[PDB]
Design a protein around this ligand. Structure first.
Ligand SMILES: [Mg+2]
Lengths: 40, 128, 162, 96, 513, 434
RNA sequence: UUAGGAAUAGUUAAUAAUAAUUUAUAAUUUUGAUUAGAUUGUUUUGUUAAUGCUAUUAGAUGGGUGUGGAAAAAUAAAAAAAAUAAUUAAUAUAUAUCAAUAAUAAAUUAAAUUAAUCUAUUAGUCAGAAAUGGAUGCCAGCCGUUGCGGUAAUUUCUAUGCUUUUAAAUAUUAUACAAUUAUCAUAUUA
């Protein structure tokens, strides 16, 4: 399941979900680290 | 979270309708009478008409006719500027129009200003 | 009430909403059972009859050609050369939509789909005077294994057979 | 109600001869048990109550049973339903 | 299939009646399918269920499907109060994100039940427990000379009026706010101990600043909110250079005591030295032996001021803190609008001469006109049953008495008058003794839930209590003839509500251009 | 009930005395009519009065929430007042959704109890004659909908059985005719603690002749025969409950043979001195009293020359006085309560402890308690409204069990009080003397 | 597969024929059809010396939406469902704890699932004598709706012990002795 942290981009919309899937570059970097540790 | 299997396939990517649950049960005879009485309530038709089975909005030929048949909100223009506003809406506010206005056409609307009511019609054309 | 159920579906199928709205308006005023809640407003209140327009069209002349055209009140007609070119646009557009077949109908209206009729004698019932054209009752009225137990015959030979 | 036609546990329709017309439209009693009590008063005197029965003819132990029914009603044991059901029960020709 | 044990008998097929989903949708207010004509002024009670009442259903509760023009009903919602925590951003962690925004409503209820096993002292909860320090920091702001307290009360009136209707000509707001308190103190001078009710803004002691730009927060740490409230909250301008008030939409219903010159107690009373008139015959025991009635406090004796709290500029959401009785006086415009709408629908839909029977539900073929006349007569019977007729000054209107509990939401429209009384307890009246005399001599058991009232020219301010929180919202739009003629509720089952309340009404050409 | 329209609210607009429904208005609109004193009866369908019955009982509990003991007594008084206004007509077969003989569909609670084909063909007529015994069509022109719902449940007890689970092993069914209160899941657990107590204390105490007081449906009598007590006799002031219980004992096989049912107010007669029925002395006397919300609250003293208590305390002092005349020596009494007398009435003292400490006629031999495990109605009088116990009252209720013996029989039970883990009073240790 | 056995059809084949304007001496059925009744099937069950008798609960579902690879789609305690959510263990659910509502009904049938000391173990046995434990009335008083009495009526069915067990039905005939009551039926001829 794709994790939605609290510090993602919030979608201020009353017609749908309140949080998007747009990350932070720190989240991108740590996801790359976890990707390498799974790649082994 | 898609409505691919909850509504018919012609309602794919469909947004902005009044209620898309209406157009799934149109073919029932209690709702088919309601659709034909609504077209008579909207006017513009000389014969009884039902919208097509795979359409939720009005068709492009029918919505163009009711836009052309619609009486303008300003009736009986006194000033030649107000006659130019009615020419502005027939040219630059037609149904599914393509042509854009011209800054020379804005100069024509700004040269016919006589009364202070004409400036409110002219500056609202400047905002468009 | 059986006559109003059939005659409403025939006028809807034959594209007559003025005759169908007047039928629901008539059955609510006469006190027909099942139709006292369905009462429609008359949207054709100012419009004349359909046969009177065809009689007037064979024989004010600008309003004679556009007497059939229905307007909301906040609508105005076009010039007579421009409106007549617009009326032929809607004429060729309506027949273009009605000529396209619906792909899973077997050439039938939605009134014809799943409309099998046998009289009330076909499902465990006999003559009554008030049931003129009575549709036979569904198979969920009499379940098997509630009238007779398992491996025992029930006295309904032709019930579930449609 | 029990003699009316009903489907049994095997589904076949059975009907008892009680709900036929001969046994259905049957009067309750046959014996002259319909009696008159002209006056029945419960008067609270000092330290006691007095139940007065004024009537031309009485049945066997009728007054002594009505006194027990009134005593049970004085403790609050019956209602409008049970008194009417006991009056509709009628005569019982059995000691036990 | 399912494994079923074989039996040599017939099988029972049950069609057993469940709890109707339409019933709980009409009770919870989440039906969205009921087309109901004949708009009335009787109030609507809605039991708030778990996650069943939002702004989408409350918009249809205000404007029903019949084509209404104005929300002319008082809406009581049992257990609909919400409590919001303040939200803040997290500086630490993997990034910047705002948390803390959450609603305590529908899960943490007011007045938790006290059942325990061992003149008589019982344990109860009369005040709302969540907002009790928030009411405490308001009640302590008025705690104490007397003139400083009088100008503190006059300076905190909401909008200068405080809900009171008083005629004021050629007068500014700051002098009118003092003249209203002077009129109240001149009126309450004759009684030894009386009370009055006012609307009051939040004081400066209830709002504290937080450094991060500038954040104002409440003292109790909790915010009384209504999550199903539609529209925008009322913006109040701060005077002291006019800026917005940080919590101007949250107001208080203050009860102020005057001086002039959690333990209820129950007692069983006895007496020393035709019962059922609705029943035809006589019974050996009554079918209903005892009655239960609501006990209210005493109103002091009464020219006389109006003493009615009217909000003509905002929509009111009352969140009671104690058991209150609200007597709503209906304005003339709402009953006139309902009368003209019902008569318009009757002359449009029912053109039959109706035959003139004896009563409405008589023997005969039930036509459409007879159904409409029966529904209108039942609506009139509901209006006559749940209301009373009082006198004015010359004037007479419907008065609806509403029992409001802590935790409820009472939506009051603009222009509706109401008087506030405090519910003190519960009495029991037996039907045998009440047939011969007044029910005051027929009291059997009396529970006094409010043991409050103590007994230690002009009038002096003794104390201040917060009986309710007044959430003021911007006035909801009144539809015109063309807007109500084209208003369809099926266009608002998903969206278009924030556009309905932001813009004025709805579009006349909405979704058919 | 036959209405009197002259004493109603609006005899001009509604000359029949009631406001017909027609199934169009909301539930809170009907609830505002009932609160003002107007009678409500359906016009066309039973579904309109069934929807008005469920919603008014739900709206009344929201206006008067059960927050303490004094709020349940007020809610039971308010619900009894409002539900009497919700009427149904006497000839309920003229309504639309009573039965449909062609579609085999009907509305009402009879679809929970009976079959579709069985109701719409034969059982609509048997229920029509079932109401005529208790409520005739002559004397009554209208029925309260709570009485109509109880008649449909009592017709189920007349047609088929009523299992007492988990008191009876799945095949013994009782048939309470009408007006006899059956037991719910909460009413079963004071008898479930007693059945486990009687399973273990039969033989150490040598119980043979049991006497059951206020049997009602006979559930306390049949539970004693399951544990092995040979001679049981029940006393019931309802005469129709006595005839039904002895007919169920014949239906329940050959292991219910020495069971007897007599009509008596609280105890047997004990009037004849020449026939001497005093030789039949019971060694165990059981009492399972009913605890209604109106009866638990209004307990007070009445009477000048015969001063007596009323309510639950007056029912206990009737049991605590005359039990010695029917008990043998070395015999016990068993009281099955449910701790609602202390919850719904906490200001008054304990009525069972008032007999032991003050009157000094009985000695507490044993006491047990067990928390309530299920939910449902508690001591439901039949023709009134249903009221299930809320959660905050259910978690504090306990199924009690009181075992008392005579003050004169201390010397027999003296060695029982000498065991470790027991509670002897100060009077039985002075009579033991090592 | 039917204790009392007869007809059936959107029909059979050919075909330059998708989407049959034609051809034919067409097709099923007494070797048992179609229809009507009963009806998921299944060396899994039970029994026996038994190739006998007797049971069954895997499933599927031409008009709800031509979407989708496939309609199986209006509801299932897992089948973990695109970042290692968690992967030590046992409860794995109540506790997703309130709420209209009823045990009518649906299953099920023992043999520890953490530790904080301490109770576990039918009966003073009933060879047959007891049971306010069932069923159960009758009668003329010289004779009127007064409701006194024989009369505290007598007989008839019983549990229990005694899971050494006793009464009710079925298995195991896979054979039914003769002569009769009744039906499915070849006349024995150089
Ligand atoms: Mg050929």
């Amino acid at each position: 399941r794709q994790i939605r942290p609290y510090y993602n981009l919030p979608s201020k919309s009353e017609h749908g979900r309140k949080m998007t899937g747009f990350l932070t570059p720190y989240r991108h970097w740590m996801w790359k680290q976890n990707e390498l540790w799974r790649n082994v | 979270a898609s409505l691919r299997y909850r509504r018919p396939y012609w309602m794919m990517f469909l947004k902005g309708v009044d209620n898309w649950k209406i157009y799934t049960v149109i073919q029932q005879p209690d709702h088919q009478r309601t659709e034909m009485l609504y077209q008579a309530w909207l006017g513009g038709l000389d014969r009884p008409y039902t919208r097509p089975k795979c359409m939720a909005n009005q068709p492009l030929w029918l919505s163009k006719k009711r836009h052309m048949l619609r009486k303008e909100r300003l009736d009986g223009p006194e000033t030649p500027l107000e006659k130019y506003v009615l020419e502005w809406h027939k040219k630059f506010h037609s149904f599914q129009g393509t042509e854009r206005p011209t800054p020379d056409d804005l100069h024509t609307a700004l040269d016919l200003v006589e009364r202070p009511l004409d400036l409110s019609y002219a500056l609202q054309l400047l905002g468009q | 009430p059986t006559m109003v159920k059939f005659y409403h579906d025939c006028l809807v199928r034959n594209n007559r909403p003025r005759e169908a709205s007047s039928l629901m308006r008539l059955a609510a005023e006469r006190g027909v059972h099942g139709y006292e809640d369905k009462w429609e407003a008359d949207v054709y209140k100012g419009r004349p009859l359909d046969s009177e327009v065809m009689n007037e069209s064979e024989g004010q002349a600008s309003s004679l050609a556009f007497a059939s055209l229905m307007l909301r009140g906040d609508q105005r007609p076009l010039p007579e050369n421009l409106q007549a070119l617009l009326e032929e646009e809607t004429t060729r557009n309506i027949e273009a939509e009605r000529s396209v077949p619906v792909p899973f109908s077997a050439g039938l209206h939605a009134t014809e789909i799943n409309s099998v009729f046998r009289p009330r004698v076909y499902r465990q019932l006999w003559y009554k005077w008030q049931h003129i054209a009575n549709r036979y009752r569904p198979t969920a009225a009499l379940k098997r294994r509630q009238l007779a137990p398992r491996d025992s015959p029930t006295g309904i030979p032709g019930f579930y057979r449609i | 109600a029990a003699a009316l036609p009903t489907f049994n546990e095997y589904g076949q329709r059975v009907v008892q001869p009680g709900a036929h017309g001969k046994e259905y439209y049957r009067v309750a009693t046959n014996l002259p048990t319909v009696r008159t009590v002209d006056r029945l008063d419960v008067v609270r005197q000092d330290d006691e109550v007095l139940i007065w029965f004024v009537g031309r003819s009485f049945l066997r132990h009728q007054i002594r049973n009505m006194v027990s029914v009134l005593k049970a009603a004085g403790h609050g044991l019956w209602n409008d339903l049970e008194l009417q059901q006991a009056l509709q029960s009628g005569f019982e020709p059995s000691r036990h | 299939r399912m494994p079923r044990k074989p039996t040599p008998y017939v099988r029972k097929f049950l069609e057993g009646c469940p709890l109707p989903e339409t019933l709980v949708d009409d009770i919870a207010g989440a039906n969205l399918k009921s087309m109901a004509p004949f708009f009335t002024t009787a109030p609507r009670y809605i039991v708030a269920a778990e996650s069943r009442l939002s702004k989408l259903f409350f918009h249809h509760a205000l404007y029903p499907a019949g084509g209404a023009r104005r929300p002319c009903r008082v809406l009581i919602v049992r257990g609909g109060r919400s409590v919001r925590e303040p939200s803040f951003t997290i500086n630490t962690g993997g990034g910047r994100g705002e948390v803390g925004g959450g609603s305590r409503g529908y899960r943490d209820p007011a007045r938790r039940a006290y059942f325990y096993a061992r003149a008589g002292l019982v344990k109860r909860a009369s005040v709302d427990g969540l907002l009790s320090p928030l009411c405490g920091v308001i009640e302590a702001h008025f705690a104490v000379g007397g003139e400083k307290l009088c100008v503190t009360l006059a300076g905190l009136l909401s909008g200068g009026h405080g809900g009171l209707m008083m005629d004021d000509g050629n007068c500014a707001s700051n002098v009118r706010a003092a003249k209203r308190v002077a009129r109240l103190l001149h009126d309450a001078a004759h009684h030894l101990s009386s009370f009055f009710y006012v609307h009051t803004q939040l004081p400066d002691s209830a709002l504290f600043v937080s450094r991060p730009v500038a954040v104002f927060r409440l003292a109790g740490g909790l915010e009384p909110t209504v999550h199903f409230a539609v529209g925008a909250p009322l913006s109040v301008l701060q005077r002291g250079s006019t800026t917005v008030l940080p919590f101007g939409h949250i107001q208080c219903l203050l009860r102020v005591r005057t001086r002039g010159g959690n333990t209820p107690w129950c007692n069983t009373a006895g007496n020393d030295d035709i019962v059922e008139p609705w029943k035809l015959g006589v019974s050996l025991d009554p079918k209903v032996p005892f009655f239960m009635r609501t006990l209210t406090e005493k109103r002091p004796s009464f020219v006389h001021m109006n003493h009615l709290l009217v909000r003509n500029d905002c929509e009111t959401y009352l969140l009671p803190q104690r058991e209150l009785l609200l007597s709503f006086h209906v304005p003339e415009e709402a009953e006139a609008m309902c009368k003209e709408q019902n008569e318009e629908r009757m002359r449009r839909q029912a053109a039959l001469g109706y035959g003139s029977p004896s009563h409405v539900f008589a023997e005969g073929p039930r036509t459409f006109a007879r159904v409409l006349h029966g529904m209108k007569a039942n609506l009139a019977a509901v209006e006559e049953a749940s209301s009373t007729f009082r006198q004015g000054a010359s004037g007479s209107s419907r008065v609806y008495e509403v029992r409001a509990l802590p935790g409820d939401v009472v939506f009051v429209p603009r222009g509706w008058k109401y008087s506030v009384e405090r519910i003190v307890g519960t009495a029991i009246i037996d039907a045998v003794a009440a047939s011969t005399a007044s029910p005051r001599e027929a009291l059997r058991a009396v529970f006094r839930t409010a043991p409050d009232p103590p007994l230690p020219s002009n009038a002096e301010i003794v104390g201040v209590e917060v009986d309710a929180f007044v959430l003021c919202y911007k006035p909801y739009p009144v539809l015109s003839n063309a807007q109500a003629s084209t208003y369809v509720a099926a266009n608002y089952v998903h969206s278009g509500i924030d556009d309905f309340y932001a813009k004025g009404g709805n579009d006349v050409y909405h979704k058919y251009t | 009930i036959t209405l009197r329209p002259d004493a109603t609210v609006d005899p001009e607009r509604y000359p029949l005395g009631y406001v017909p429904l027609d199934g169009s208005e909301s539930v809170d609109s009907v609830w505002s009519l009932v609160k003002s004193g107007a009678f409500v009866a359906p016009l066309s369908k039973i579904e309109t009065i069934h929807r008005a019955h469920v919603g008014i009982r739900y709206l009344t509990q929201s206006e008067y929430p059960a927050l303490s003991s004094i709020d349940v007594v007020g809610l039971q008084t308010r619900l009894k007042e409002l539900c009497s206004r919700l009427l149904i007509r006497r000839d309920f077969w003229v309504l639309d959704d009573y039965n449909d003989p062609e579609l085999n569909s009907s509305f009402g609670i009879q679809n929970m109890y009976f079959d579709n084909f069985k109701w719409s063909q034969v059982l609509w007529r048997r229920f029509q004659q079932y109401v005529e015994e208790y409520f005739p069509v002559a004397e009554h022109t209208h029925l309260t909908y709570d009485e109509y719902l109880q008649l449909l449940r009592s017709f189920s007890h007349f047609e088929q059985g009523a299992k007492l689970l988990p008191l009876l092993p799945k095949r013994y069914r009782i048939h309470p005719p009408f007006g006899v209160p059956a037991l719910s899941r909460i009413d079963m657990e004071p008898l479930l603690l007693y059945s486990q107590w009687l399973k273990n204390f039969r033989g150490p105490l040598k119980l043979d002749a049991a006497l059951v007081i206020r049997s009602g449906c006979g559930a306390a009598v049949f539970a004693t025969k399951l544990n092995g007590v040979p001679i049981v006799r029940g006393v019931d002031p309802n005469p129709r409950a006595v005839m039904s219980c002895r007919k169920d004992a014949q239906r329940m096989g050959r292991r219910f043979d020495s069971i007897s049912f007599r009509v008596g107010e609280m105890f047997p007669d004990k009037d004849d001195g020449n026939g001497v029925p005093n030789s039949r002395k019971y060694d165990i006397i059981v009492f399972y009293p009913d605890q209604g919300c109106y009866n638990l609250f209004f307990t007070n003293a009445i009477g000048e020359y015969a001063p007596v208590l009323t309510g639950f305390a007056g029912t206990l002092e009737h049991f605590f006085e005359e039990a010695g005349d029917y008990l043998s020596d070395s015999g016990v009494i068993v009281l099955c309560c449910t701790n609602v007398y202390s919850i719904l009435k906490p200001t008054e003292p304990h009525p069972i402890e008032y007999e032991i400490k003050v009157n000094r006629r009985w000695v507490l031999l044993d006491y047990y308690d067990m928390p309530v495990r299920g939910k449902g109605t508690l001591s439901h009088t039949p023709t009134d409204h249903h009221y299930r116990i809320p959660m905050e009252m259910r978690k504090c209720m306990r199924s009690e069990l009181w075992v008392l013996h005579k003050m004169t029989s201390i010397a027999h039970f003296a060695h029982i009080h000498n065991i470790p883990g027991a509670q002897p009073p100060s009077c039985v240790v002075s009579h033991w003397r090592n």
